[PDB]
Design a protein around this ligand. Structure first.
Ligand SMILES: [Ca+2]
Length: 262
């Protein structure tokens, strides 16, 4: 048996739902905290199935946690402790966001009021824009992390052959801020060929698609966290085989490393 499995067997409707199996509540973290700008922790109230994996979500350039807030209850209700952080300033660069993401991971595991609900050996990182660049930076610096999901990422550093964390990059086809040609795709193609990974390109989507309720982003983010943070093979079904990318699909592109071994 897998000791990290949480919640009932998934279905298409359960993984795409606005709220999962687990009721959640929130805890507010002050900006007084050292190393980042604080934020909000979304967590499951039910302790009976054990501790959960932890997830830090960073925002983009000029943005705050309010742009990522919808992912809080949505991911957390599937069985995760999700920490939507603010940065120190709204204009911090990607590598600074990386270090702030790292400090938030440590805060979550060591200092937070819900530390006893987090398994500190099973952590993940997500981020938008420059926060997605920071996601990669954090992943590169901490190979023990279980998953990384950069959302429409931006970073001048194009080479991430170093990264050993299973990463799902979600790009937006029509992104003009962090063009997929010059950001997302270079990042993905640089990833090691033996690294479990995925590139998801949303058809007709804008740079700010990750900042609004999106069933596609939610489904695949959830499925990726389940598969690697929880090593949950029950969610393999939503990642493999990969979705269609032809006419009338939500994906303009999809690149995979199926099957997923952990
Ligand atoms: Ca594989």
């Amino acid at each position: 048996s897998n000791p990290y499995e949480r919640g009932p067997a998934p279905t298409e409707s359960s993984v795409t739902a606005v709220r999962g199996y687990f009721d959640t509540d929130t805890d507010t973290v002050s900006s007084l905290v050292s190393g980042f700008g604080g934020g909000t922790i979304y967590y499951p109230t039910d302790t009976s199935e054990g501790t959960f994996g932890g997830v830090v979500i960073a925002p983009g350039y000029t943005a705050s946690q309010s742009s990522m807030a919808w992912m809080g209850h949505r991911i957390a209700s599937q069985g995760f402790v999700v920490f939507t952080i603010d940065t120190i300033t709204r204009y911090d660069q990607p590598d600074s966001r990386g270090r702030q993401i790292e400090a938030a991971l440590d805060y979550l595991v060591e200092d937070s009021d819900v530390a006893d609900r987090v398994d500190g050996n099973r952590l993940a990182v997500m981020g938008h824009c420059m926060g997605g660049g920071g996601t990669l930076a954090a992943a590169e610096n901490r190979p023990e992390l279980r998953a990384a999901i950069p959302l429409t990422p931006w970073h001048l550093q194009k080479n991430w052959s170093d990264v050993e964390v299973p990463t799902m990059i979600i790009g937006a086809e029509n992104d003009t801020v962090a063009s997929v040609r010059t950001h997302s795709i270079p990042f993905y193609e640089s990833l090691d060929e033996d690294l479990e990974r995925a590139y998801l390109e949303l058809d007709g989507a804008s740079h700010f698609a990750p900042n609004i309720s999106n069933t596609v982003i939610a489904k695949y983010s959830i499925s990726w966290l389940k598969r690697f943070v929880d090593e949950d093979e029950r969610y393999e079904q939503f990642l493999c085989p990969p979705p269609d990318t032809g006419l009338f699909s939500d994906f303009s592109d999809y690149r995979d490393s199926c099957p997923h071994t952990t």
